[PDB]
Design a protein around this ligand. Structure first.
Ligand code: HEM
Ligand code: HEM
Ligand code: HEM
Ligand code: HEM
Lengths: 141, 146, 141, 146
């Protein structure tokens, strides 16, 4: 599924993400709505009324599921299955959307980390978020 | 799109013999069996998880008839590609956000099953002629993403 | 790099491709020019004047390099290197073009084979031609 | 594209402080270091094969100045996006067939380095505002693919 050095660059990035994880998830969603107008076509039931209590909570959940991906990055095929069963068995959330929010994360991470755009960190976080996508878009298992 | 008259004759006469339910079942089948992002809709198809499941699925054949019936509304009205498909471009965002990358693949895949089903007739320009209508169809469903 | 069953579906397809390999390569190129007009933007020095003596010869070479990929499908990283050194060190041939000609092959194969669109054969030939791309688009090695 | 006046103020004032050579070196660097299809042009850059190679390459910085200088010709003339870029859309096909998938990535990547370089100022709409100009820029270079 993945490589050894990519995990190290993810664990390093996610280590400075720390408690900020939920805020970067929240920002990455708001960013995806603004920076890819097509996601407003999903008819979100959310308010997006600035400072939104639902976006910070969803942000923490997306972030904790990213922590779960970091904790299990070669072992996550079933550990994100409840989130696959969400994005598939409800709403039909296209995995192409994931790439947009993931760009939005990479950007927000770059707003706080040393470079974030190195070969080791950019190739890693693009292909790691791509495997988080691949595993969120698994079948029945 | 706007094909040349000989290209139009080639694509529309291949359409004229086309088995819309079975070329549609096998277009939509051919796409679905790569296990791509369109497999997330496997629950509305009700069968896809195996070759025999997707190729024999009455819902993949029926949905095949709808996607290709619209493709034919294309070959009947290529002067539109902005109004004939607009209700579809709406469905395929305002009710189904589902990314138009998926439409590009169905399109590409359609040309392939036609060349399977009519492989003695699959000429270098007939497949491209198909692709010009098809690239139109994907751009038309994607119009609502302005 | 790849999977075991994909090789079997490639070896099966390429087995009925046989002597026709060069003609399917030749058709796949002409098909890519017609079906993806952007390749005419490369300013080809070729004539494309029907029945072209250069397209049949290039077709046989593309096809023999596909035979070399089939013969070495997990061992080709350097075996297509002369062709990488072509597509990179000359003309800058974008690997996105490869996907177009590969679709064009899959189509021409389907015009002669039983289904060609099975899960086993379509997933295989899409991801095999994708690895032929990945290996034609290798670095210095 | 056609951003709202507050969005325009945000993107163009972030442009107004932008280090065009170093944000350009790091935009083009950020793209090049994923080892994507744009690495096939590494021979014209002359350095890319390592982090220090691409980030310090005078040719990646200089080419960064050209791509982003054109992006600024965008923010100066958003009423065009069809004539200001047309010589580039020509260069980027009629002399450089190089696929516009590559332009979409450079574009996306550009917004990211701006948010690195000005991370205290990288607002949710400023990055999207960038992306609207950028998606315009990629569509403008892709215009010649009609
Ligand atoms: C970075 C990858 C993502 C992760 C890890 C993730 C994680 C989650 C989690 C943990 C939940 C809460 C419910 C549950 O426990 O399953 C959730 C809800 C949701 N997700 Fe995601 N998600 C991701 C990507 C996406 C994408 C691409 C979209 C599309 C815009 C999306 C849209 C939603 C929506 C609409 C909900 C339901 C809101 C609610 O809680 O009522 N997610 N996601
Ligand atoms: C590009 C070729 C395609 C065309 C021209 C097309 C056309 C159509 C047509 C004519 C309908 C029915 C319209 C109606 O009842 O008002 C339809 C429905 C639908 N299409 Fe497509 N389609 C295409 C591609 C796709 C793809 C690739 C997907 C999957 C990702 C998709 C998913 C759907 C769904 C889910 C429905 C059912 C919506 C409903 O009525 O509840 N289509 N399509
Ligand atoms: C299916 C993958 C492909 C294979 C296996 C392949 C193989 C070859 C081979 C063997 C040669 C002859 C020279 C040599 O020995 O290196 C060649 C020439 C060439 N290829 Fe490809 N090629 C492929 C894809 C492409 C693509 C995507 C294009 C772009 C349209 C392309 C354009 C050319 C051109 C322009 C030449 C030079 C013509 C000449 O022989 O003077 N090739 N290729
Ligand atoms: C989407 C953002 C981009 C813009 C706006 C852009 C703009 C420019 C500009 C202004 C020039 C010089 C024009 C001239 O001298 O007449 C140029 C040259 C060039 N660009 Fe881009 N570019 C972009 C993306 C790319 C990408 C991603 C690639 C690589 C795949 C690329 C490859 C080239 C090459 C090879 C040249 C040099 C051609 C020559 O003059 O010999 N550009 N670019």
């Amino acid at each position: 599924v993945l490589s050894p050095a990519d995990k190290t660059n993810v664990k390093a990035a996610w280590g400075k993400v720390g408690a900020h994880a939920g805020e970067y998830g929240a920002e990455a969603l708001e960013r995806m709505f603004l920076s890819f107008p097509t996601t407003k076509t999903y008819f979100p039931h959310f308010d997006l009324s600035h400072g939104s209590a639902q976006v910070k909570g969803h942000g923490k959940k997306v972030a904790d599921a990213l922590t779960n991906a970091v904790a299990h990055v070669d072992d996550m095929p079933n550990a994100l299955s409840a989130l696959s069963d969400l994005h598939a068995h409800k709403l039909r959330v296209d995995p192409v959307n994931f790439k947009l929010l993931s760009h939005c994360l990479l950007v927000t991470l770059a707003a706080h980390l040393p470079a974030e755009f190195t070969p080791a960190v950019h190739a890693s976080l693009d292909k790691f978020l791509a495997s988080v996508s691949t595993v969120l878009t698994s079948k029945y298992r | 799109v706007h094909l040349t008259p000989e290209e139009k004759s080639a694509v529309t006469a291949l359409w004229g013999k086309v088995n819309v339910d079975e070329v549609g079942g096998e277009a939509l089948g051919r796409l679905l069996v790569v296990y791509p992002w369109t497999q997330r809709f496997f629950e509305s198809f009700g069968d896809l998880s195996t070759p025999d499941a997707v190729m024999g699925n009455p819902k993949v054949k029926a949905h095949g008839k709808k996607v290709l019936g619209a493709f034919s509304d294309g070959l009947a009205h290529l002067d539109n590609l902005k109004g004939t498909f607009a209700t579809l471009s709406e469905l395929h965002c305002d009710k189904l956000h589902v990314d138009p990358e998926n439409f590009r693949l169905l399109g590409n895949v359609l040309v392939c099953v036609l060349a399977h089903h009519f492989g003695k007739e699959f000429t270098p320009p007939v497949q491209a002629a198909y692709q010009k209508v098809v690239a139109g169809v994907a751009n038309a469903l994607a119009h609502k993403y302005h």
